């Protein structure tokens, strides 16, 4: 249902200010690639590590879910 991917402090991930419900949200690189964020305010960057929010309605807009957690 919700991507269980975890990453470390020197692993890249994606912020998307269009899709997020708060500034600490983030999704993993594969979930970003397999989703639809054209014209979104997104950035690949480091996040101090984290757990993917893709598929979690409390953290991320449904339109921003990748094809595998939608
Ligand atoms: Zn987005
Ligand atoms: Zn993910
Ligand atoms: Zn996903």
- Ligand 3 center from residue 17 Cα (angstroms): 17
Q: Shortest CA distance to 2 belongs to which of 39, 43, 54?
A: 54
Q: Shortest CA distance to 18 belongs to which of 5, 34, 1, 37?
A: 37
Q: Are the CB atoms for 46 and 10 separated by under 8 Å?
A: yes
Could you give the number of structural domains in the chain?
Answer: 1
Resolution of this model in Å is: 1.6
Report the Cα 18 to chain-centroid distance in Å.
Answer: 11
Rounded Cα–Cα distance for residues 5 and 14 (Å): 13
- Ligand 1 center from residue 10 Cα (angstroms): 22
Domain around 25: 3-70
Report the Cα 5 to chain-centroid distance in Å.
Answer: 10
Tokens standing for residue 61:
């807009």
Q: What is the DSSP string of the chain?
A: -----EE-TTSEEEEETTTBSSTT--B-HHHHHTS--TT--EEEEE-SSEE--TT-TTTB-GGG--TT--
**Closest ligand to Cα 64:** 1
Rounded Cα–Cα distance for residues 48 and 62 (Å): 24
Q: Which residues surround ligand 1, an ion (CB under 5 A)?
A: 16, 18-19, 37, 40, 64
> Which residues define the annotated binding site?
3, 16, 19, 28, 31, 37, 40, 52, 54, 66, 69
């Amino acid at each position: 249902a919700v991507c269980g991917s975890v990453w470390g402090q020197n692993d890249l991930a994606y912020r998307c200010r269009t899709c997020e419900h708060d500034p600490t949200c983030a999704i993993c690189v594969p979930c970003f690639q397999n989703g639809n964020h054209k014209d979104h305010d997104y950035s690949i960057m480091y996040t101090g590590g984290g757990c993917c929010d893709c598929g979690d309605t409390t953290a991320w807009k449904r339109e921003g879910f990748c094809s595998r957690h939608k």
